[PDB]
Amino acid sequence: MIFTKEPANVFYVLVSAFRSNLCDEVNMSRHRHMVSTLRAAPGLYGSVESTDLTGCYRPTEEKTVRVRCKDKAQALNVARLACNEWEQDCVLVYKSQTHTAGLVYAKGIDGYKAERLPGSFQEVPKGAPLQGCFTIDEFGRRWQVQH
Amino acid sequence: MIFTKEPANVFYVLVSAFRSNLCDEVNMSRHRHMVSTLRAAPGLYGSVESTDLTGCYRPTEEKTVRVRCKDKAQALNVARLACNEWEQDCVLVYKSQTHTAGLVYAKGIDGYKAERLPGSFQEVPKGAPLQGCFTIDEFGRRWQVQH
Amino acid sequence: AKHLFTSESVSEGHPDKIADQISDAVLDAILEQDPKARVACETYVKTGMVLVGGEITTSAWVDIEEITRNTVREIGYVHSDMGFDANSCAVLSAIGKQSPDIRADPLEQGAGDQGLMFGYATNETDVLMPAPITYAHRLVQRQAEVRKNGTLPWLRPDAKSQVTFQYDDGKIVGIDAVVLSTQHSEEIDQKSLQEAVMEEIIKPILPAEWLTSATKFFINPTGRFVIGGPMGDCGLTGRKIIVDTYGGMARHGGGAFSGKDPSKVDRSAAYAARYVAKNIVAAGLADRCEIQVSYAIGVAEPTSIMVETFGTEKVPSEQLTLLVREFFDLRPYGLIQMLDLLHPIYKETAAYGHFGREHFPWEKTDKAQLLRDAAGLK
Amino acid sequence: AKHLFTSESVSEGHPDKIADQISDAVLDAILEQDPKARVACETYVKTGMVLVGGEITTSAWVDIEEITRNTVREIGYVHSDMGFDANSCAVLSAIGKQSPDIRADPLEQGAGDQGLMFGYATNETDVLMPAPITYAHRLVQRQAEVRKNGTLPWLRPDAKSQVTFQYDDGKIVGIDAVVLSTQHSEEIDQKSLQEAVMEEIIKPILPAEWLTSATKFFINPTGRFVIGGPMGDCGLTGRKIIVDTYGGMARHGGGAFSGKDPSKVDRSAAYAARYVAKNIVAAGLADRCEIQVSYAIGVAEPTSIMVETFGTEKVPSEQLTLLVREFFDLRPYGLIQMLDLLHPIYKETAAYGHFGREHFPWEKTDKAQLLRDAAGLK
Ligand SMILES: [Cl-]
Ligand SMILES: [Cl-]
State the distance from the centre of ligand 1 to the C-alpha of C48, rounded, in angstroms.
65
Among all bound ligands, the one having the nearest atom to the CA of A91 is 1
Out of B1, B98, B126, whose CB is closest to C207?
B98
* Paired residues of D84 in beta bridges: none
Angle at C41 between CA C36 and CA C42, to 5 degrees: 165
Q: What is the DSSP letter of D212?
A: -
Which residues in chain C touch residue B8, judged by CB atoms under 8 angstroms apart?
A: 204-207
Chains touching chain B through at least 3 C-beta pairs below 8 angstroms are C
Provide the CA C195 distance to its chain's centre, in angstroms: 30
Strand intervals (E) in C26-136: 38-45, 49-57, 90-98, 115-122
- Is the Cβ pair C4, D307 closer than 8 Å? no
Q: Which residue of D has its CA nearest to A6?
A: D126
Contact D154, D225 (CB under 8 A): no
C-alpha–C-alpha distance, residues D282 and D279, integer Å: 5
Q: Chain D within 8 Å of C160 (Cβ-Cβ)?
A: yes
State the distance from the centre of ligand 1 to the C-alpha of A9, rounded, in angstroms.
12
Number of helices and strands in chain A (H, E): 3, 9
Burial of A41 from C-beta contacts in 10 A (0-12 / 13-18 / 19+): exposed
Which residues in chain C touch residue B100, judged by CB atoms under 8 angstroms apart?
A: 209
Q: Which of D11, D55, D116 to mutate to test the interface with C (most CBs of C within 10 A)?
A: D116
- Is the Cβ pair D127, A9 closer than 8 Å? no
Which residues in chain C touch residue D297, judged by CB atoms under 8 angstroms apart?
A: 179, 181, 221-222
Contact C314, C284 (CB under 8 A): yes
A touches D, CB cut-off 8 Å, minimum 3 pairs = yes
C-alpha–C-alpha distance, residues D214 and C151, integer Å: 64
Is C191 assigned a ligand-binding role in the annotation?
no
Q: Which residue of C has its CA nearest to D290?
A: C248
Q: Three-state DSSP class for B65?
A: strand
- Is the Cβ pair C3, D317 closer than 8 Å? yes
Q: Which residue of C has its CA nearest to D109?
A: C222
Fold of D15-107: GMP Synthetase; Chain A, domain 3 (3.30.300)
Q: Chain C within 8 Å of D161 (Cβ-Cβ)?
A: no
C-alpha–C-alpha distance, residues D240 and C105, integer Å: 33
Provide the CA C366 distance to its chain's centre, in angstroms: 22
How many CB atoms sit inside 10 A of residue C92's CB? Answer: 14
- Say which residues have a Cβ less than 8 Å from residue D117's Cβ, sequence separation at least 6: D253, D255, D265, D266, D269, D270, D272, D273, D292, D293, D294
Out of B5, B98, B127, whose CB is closest to C209?
B98
State the distance from the centre of ligand 1 to the C-alpha of A75, rounded, in angstroms.
10
Burial of B59 from C-beta contacts in 10 A (0-12 / 13-18 / 19+): exposed
- Say which residues have a Cβ less than 8 Å from residue D233's Cβ, sequence separation at least 6: C40, C55, D15
DSSP code per residue over D127-185: TSS-HHHHHHHHHHHHHHHHHHHTSSTTEEEEEEEEEEEEEETTEEEEEEEEEEEEEE-
State the distance from the centre of ligand 2 to the C-alpha of C209, rounded, in angstroms.
10
Among all bound ligands, the one having the nearest atom to the CA of B113 is 2
Is C195 assigned a ligand-binding role in the annotation?
no
Provide the CA D377 distance to its chain's centre, in angstroms: 33
Q: Which residue of B has its CA nearest to C206?
A: B8
C touches A, CB cut-off 8 Å, minimum 3 pairs = no
Q: What do you get for the CA distance between the two ends of chain C, in Å? A: 34
Q: List chain A gaps (C–N > 2.5 A) by preceding residue.
A: 58
Is C38 assigned a ligand-binding role in the annotation?
no
Neighbouring residues of the ion ligand 2, judged by CB less than 5 Å:
B 102
- Is the Cβ pair A96, D127 closer than 8 Å? no
- Say which residues have a Cβ less than 8 Å from residue A133's Cβ, sequence separation at least 6: A55, A56, A57, A58, A144, A145
Q: Chain C within 8 Å of D307 (Cβ-Cβ)?
A: yes
C-alpha–C-alpha distance, residues C80 and C68, integer Å: 17
Note the helical H segments in C165-215. Answer: 190-197, 203-205
C-alpha–C-alpha distance, residues C55 and C172, integer Å: 45
Cα dihedral sign, B76-B82-B88-B93: negative
- Pairing of the two strands B101-105 and B91-94: antiparallel
C-alpha–C-alpha distance, residues C141 and C182, integer Å: 12
Helix (H) or strand (E) holding D23: helix D15-33
Chain C: closest CA distance from residue B96 (Å):
8
C-alpha–C-alpha distance, residues C141 and D74, integer Å: 46
Q: Which of B3, B4, B100 to mutate to test the interface with C (most CBs of C within 10 A)?
A: B4
Q: Chain D within 8 Å of C14 (Cβ-Cβ)?
A: no
Experiment used for this model: cryo-EM
Q: What is the DSSP letter of C233?
A: S
The structure was resolved to a resolution in Å of 2.8
C-alpha–C-alpha distance, residues C238 and C257, integer Å: 7
B94 backbone dihedrals φ, ψ, rounded to 5°: -135, 155
Q: Three-state DSSP class for C91?
A: strand
The Cα-based distances of C350 to B21, C238, C241, D174, D374 in angstroms read 59, 10, 10, 39, 48
C-alpha–C-alpha distance, residues A32 and B47, integer Å: 95
> What's the order of all strands across the beta sheet hosting C49-57?
C90-98, C49-57, C38-45, C235-236
- Say which residues have a Cβ less than 8 Å from residue D75's Cβ, sequence separation at least 6: D12, D13, D18, D21, D86, D157
With CA atoms as reference, report the closest residue to C249 among D250, D60, D45.
D250
Out of C126, C203, C208, whose CB is closest to B2?
C126
Number of residues in chain A: 147
State the distance from the centre of ligand 1 to the C-alpha of A79, rounded, in angstroms.
12
Among all bound ligands, the one having the nearest atom to the CA of A93 is 1
Note the helical H segments in chain C. Answer: 15-33, 64-75, 131-149, 190-197, 203-205, 241-245, 265-282, 317-327, 332-339, 368-374
How many CB atoms sit inside 10 A of residue C191's CB? Answer: 8
C-alpha–C-alpha distance, residues A87 and D284, integer Å: 41
State the distance from the centre of ligand 1 to the C-alpha of A8, rounded, in angstroms.
14
Q: Which of C55, C109, C236 to mutate to test the interface with D (most CBs of D within 10 A)?
A: C236
- Is the Cβ pair B100, C284 closer than 8 Å? no
With CA atoms as reference, report the closest residue to B17 among B48, B43, B59, B44.
B48
Buried b (16+ CB within 10 A) or exposed e, A62-87: bbbbbbbbeeeebbbbbbbbbbeebe
Helix (H) or strand (E) holding A28: helix A24-40
- Is the Cβ pair D378, A4 closer than 8 Å? no
**What residue type is D313 in one-letter code?**
E
Q: Three-state DSSP class for D247?
A: helix
Among all bound ligands, the one having the nearest atom to the CA of B91 is 2
Strand intervals (E) in chain D: 3-10, 38-45, 49-57, 90-98, 115-122, 155-168, 171-184, 216-219, 235-236, 288-295, 304-308
Interface residues of A toward D, Cβ cutoff 8 Å, are 1-6, 8-9, 95-98, 100, 125-127
Contact C14, D254 (CB under 8 A): no
Which residues in chain B touch residue C172, judged by CB atoms under 8 angstroms apart?
A: 2
Buried b (16+ CB within 10 A) or exposed e, D124-136: bbbbbbbbbbbbb
Which residues in chain C touch residue D181, judged by CB atoms under 8 angstroms apart?
A: 114, 297
C-alpha–C-alpha distance, residues C105 and C84, integer Å: 49
Q: Which residue of C has its CA nearest to D236?
A: C236
Contact D289, D302 (CB under 8 A): no
Is C224 assigned a ligand-binding role in the annotation?
yes
Within 13 A of A11's CA, how many CA atoms are on the CB side?
Answer: 24
Which residues in chain C touch residue D305, judged by CB atoms under 8 angstroms apart?
A: 4
Q: What is the DSSP letter of D107?
A: G
Out of A1, A9, A100, whose CB is closest to D124?
A1
With CA atoms as reference, report the closest residue to D7 among C251, C325, C246.
C251
State the distance from the centre of ligand 1 to the C-alpha of C232, rounded, in angstroms.
61
Helix (H) or strand (E) holding C176: strand C171-184
- Is the Cβ pair B9, C208 closer than 8 Å? yes
Q: Which of D2, D4, D6 to mutate to test the interface with C (most CBs of C within 10 A)?
A: D6
Contact C351, C14 (CB under 8 A): no
Q: Three-state DSSP class for B11?
A: strand
With CA atoms as reference, report the closest residue to B19 among B8, B11, B10, B29.
B29
Q: What is the CA radius of gyration of chain C?
A: 22
Q: Which of C126, C128, C139, C281 to mutate to test the interface with B (most CBs of B within 10 A)?
A: C126
- Is the Cβ pair D284, A5 closer than 8 Å? no
Inter-helix orientation angle D15-33/D64-75, to 10°: 130
Contact C9, C140 (CB under 8 A): yes
Q: Which residue of D has its CA nearest to A127?
A: D378
With CA atoms as reference, report the closest residue to D74 among D182, D152, D148.
D148
